[PDB]
UniProtKB/Swiss-Prot annotation, chain C:
Induction section of the entry: By heat shock. Transcriptionally regulated by CtsR. Up-regulated by heavy metals such as Cu(2+) and Cd(2+), but Zn(2+) and Co(2+) have no effect. Forms part of an operon with ctsR, mcsA and mcsB.
Lineage: Bacteria, Bacillati, Bacillota, Bacilli, Bacillales
Family that this chain belongs to: Belongs to the ClpA/ClpB family. ClpC subfamily.
Organism listed in the record: Staphylococcus aureus (strain NCTC 8325 / PS 47)
Role summary: Required for growth at high temperatures, probably by acting as a chaperone during heat shock and targeting heat-denatured proteins for degradation by ClpP. Required for biofilm formation. May act as a chaperone regulating CtsR activity.
Complex and partners: May interact with ClpP.
Protein name, entry field: ATP-dependent Clp protease ATP-binding subunit ClpC
Region of the whole protein represented: 225 to 372 of 818
């Protein structure tokens, strides 16, 4: 419904197409469903942008998302 | 009519096209058409051919020159010259004011007054000093350019200045497939036969393509295959795969018999070539040979790695030398082993190595000590087969490991692995291998190996070392430890030989080929 | 070449060595050097049989391009890896035309063999005998 609402031109221009939390047990399909969506949109699983939050265990890991402040390395 | 300075320092491509000497350009019709439509623009009509080195970027400009001569271009281009301007000595006086801009403006005004030049500028990124001279002429439309650069150079230089992006349009040039490279070679065949006066078989073409794709990673098709077939037909009635393999042996140093052996005969002889390098560990060698045969039988998903093995045994008793034997046998060199450094995973709080060497054994030294981020990378390699692209399907993954009774007082390690690692990851290793604590006779056969590797090495100094088996036998004590064995022996061979002979012949005597016959004195 | 040991496919090739000092020697004005270069390149194009040797090649693409364009100047040269890493690798128009040949560091044995050959004319210059074992 979100994908169709986007391509139909009804999506609010200022907001992303959709944002979803997939909550459930381990090994139930909720990463595979994202992979299948990416495949259906781009023909390949590899076009997904995958962020592994387990490495972001510290607050300063946030620099990997948005960069290092002026004067800091990288 | 004429452009006297430009004609001195630019290779005229369209005249070489009319002179028939230019080689054919095959299959690049999409890229040529994209260049045509970019050139027809009114404003930013300057294509940049973006692609890896050697993929055919200049061949697009030469195909354009052919299209112009062959009247295939639209009428807007029917008469334009294509001039490959070389930067090499457009810089010539790096200190003086204006000496660069002098001859640059001279070339540019010649190109202006002869308003029918298309200029090809290879390594365009090297211009970004000149940009302030080109921007006004480009804006004025007098000069029309084809650039060529790598993608990373483009991002590093041209993308950063919006005023350059406001003048140049990117055209992606990709490395052709094996099929396209074959079609290229089959076109160029006749033109190379006319030079070498040798027949070139189709099987030699496909062999050259395959072997350039499998033994020369750091270079790209078609240039690899062209270079290979050219140097082979130089080395040579007709060309054949044996000459291709000989040239690959030249470029790699790999022995020719290792190169031209089939997959099957390679993996059949495998475990003998393992046994003779490692000594002992019969169960481990049989396990790894069984597992790799099972993988290469070809039923497994061809995107997944060839193997994934955990080594449990004590210390250094044979793990690393078995990994090096596996890399030597499966892929052709000890240099086919990559030792991963775990610091890369800590550093955020390998990929560019695999890019260079995809036929390699990947060794994880003591995976227990790694950052637990390593398991994300491991799982990603072991399930998808690719990272960022870099592809692991040809690699073998080896992960090494080393996993008091307060009282009056061969299966435990299989237990303790389960709880010492993430079991969801142990669900995905292909096999688990246990190394035994080696026997004394195996250890002294190692000593016969190392003493031979010293004797023949010393023999390069004309020092014909000779040794008595019983003397080596009675150094088998000199490093037998419950913790380790294949290491302390290395601190025995130099004391028992090198320093022993440093007392016995190097001083107070003199080195001669006779008493370097080590006779057993009854003790050592 | 002079032994005619080279392939029968190129016995006619003549090897010659170009020194910039000689080419500038006695030039009296600017551009005379460059035009003497251009006319010797034209003579090279007419002859077709030449092969040109250029030591200290790193002293050199464009000014000799008119005969590197198609490769009318068949070229052989020597350089150190230092004076190769920094320049000859760093011009695509050279990497399109040159091929590096590494000349190996020789063994002790080969160096004493070449010595005990070439020794005979240094004996001549000194009028002294060289012990072959003192060489080794
Ligand atoms: N409902 C399902 N349909 C199809 N395949 C599934 C389903 N649930 C799990 N799987 C399979 O098992 C794996 C499930 O991974 P997944 O459950 O997406 O990881 P997680 O949910 O723990 O992030 C995938 O390889 C997928 O093929
Ligand atoms: N379509 C093609 N037809 C014939 N030869 C080609 C083709 N594409 C590339 N080549 C060959 O590849 C070699 C390298 O050319 P190129 O990749 O343009 O060099 P560069 O690294 O400057 O881009 C040349 O010898 C060229 O003839």
């Amino acid at each position: 419904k979100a994908v169709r609402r986007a391509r139909a031109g009804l999506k609010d221009p200022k907001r992303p197409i959709g944002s979803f939390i997939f909550l459930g047990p381990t090994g139930v399909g909720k990463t595979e469903l994202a992979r299948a969506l990416a495949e259906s949109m781009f023909g390949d699983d590899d076009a997904m942008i995958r962020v592994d939050m387990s490495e972001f265990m510290e607050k300063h890991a946030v620099s990997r998302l948005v960069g290092a402040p002026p004067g800091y390395v990288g | 009519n004429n452009t006297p300075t430009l004609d001195s320092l630019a290779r005229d491509l369209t005249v070489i096209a009319k002179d028939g000497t230019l080689d054919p350009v095959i299959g690049r019709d999409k890229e040529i058409t994209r260049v045509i439509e970019v050139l027809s623009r009114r404003t930013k009509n300057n294509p940049v051919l973006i692609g890896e080195p050697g993929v055919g970027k200049t061949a697009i400009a030469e195909g354009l020159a052919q299209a112009i001569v062959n009247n295939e271009v639209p009428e807007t281009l029917k008469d334009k010259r294509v001039m490959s301007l070389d930067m090499g000595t457009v810089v010539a006086g790096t200190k003086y004011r204006g000496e660069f801009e002098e001859r640059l403006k001279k070339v540019m005004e010649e190109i202006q007054q002869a308003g029918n030049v298309i200029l090809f500028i290879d390594e365009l990124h090297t211009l970004v000093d000149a940009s302030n001279i080109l921007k006004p002429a480009l804006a004025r439309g007098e000069l029309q350019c084809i650039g060529a650069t790598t993608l990373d150079e483009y991002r590093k230089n041209i993308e950063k200045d919006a005023a350059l992006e406001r003048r140049f349009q990117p055209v992606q040039v990709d490395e052709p497939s094996v099929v396209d490279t074959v079609a290229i070679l089959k076109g160029l065949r006749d033109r190379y036969e006319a030079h070498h006066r040798i027949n070139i078989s189709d099987e030699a073409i496909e062999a050259a393509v395959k072997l350039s794709n499998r033994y020369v990673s750091d270079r790209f098709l078609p240039d690899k295959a062209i270079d290979l077939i050219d140097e082979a037909s130089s080395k040579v009635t007709s060309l054949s795969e044996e000459d291709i393999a000989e040239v690959i042996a030249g470029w790699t140093g790999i022995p020719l018999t290792k190169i031209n052996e089939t997959e099957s005969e390679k993996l059949l002889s495998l475990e003998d070539t393992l046994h003779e390098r490692v000594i002992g560990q019969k169960d481990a060698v049989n396990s790894i040979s069984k597992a790799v045969r099972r993988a290469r039988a070809g039923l497994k998903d061809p995107k997944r790695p060839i193997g994934s093995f955990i080594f449990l045994g004590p210390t250094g008793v044979g793990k690393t030398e078995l990994a090096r034997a596996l890399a030597e046998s499966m892929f052709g060199d000890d240099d086919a082993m990559i030792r991963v450094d775990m610091s890369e995973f800590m550093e955020k709080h390998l990929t560019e190595k695999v890019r260079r060497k995809p036929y390699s054994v990947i060794l994880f030294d003591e995976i227990e000590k790694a950052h637990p981020d390593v398991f994300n990378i491991l799982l990603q390699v072991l399930d998808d087969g690719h990272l960022t692209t870099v592809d692991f399907r040809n690699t073998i993954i080896i992960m090494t490991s080393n996993v008091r009774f307060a009282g009056f007082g061969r299966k435990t390690m299989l237990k303790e692995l389960k709880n010492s690692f993430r079991p969801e990851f142990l669900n995905r290793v292909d096999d688990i291998i246990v190394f035994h604590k080696l026997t004394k006779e195996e250890l002294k056969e190692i000593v016969t190996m190392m003493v031979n590797k010293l004797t023949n090495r010393l023999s390069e100094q004309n020092i014909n070392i000779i040794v008595t088996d019983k003397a080596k036998d009675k150094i088998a004590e000199e490093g037998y430890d419950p913790e380790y064995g294949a290491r302390p022996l290395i601190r025995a061979i130099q004391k028992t030989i090198e320093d022993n002979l440093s007392e016995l012949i190097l001083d107070g005597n003199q080195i001669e080929g006779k008493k370097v016959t080590v006779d057993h004195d009854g003790k050592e």
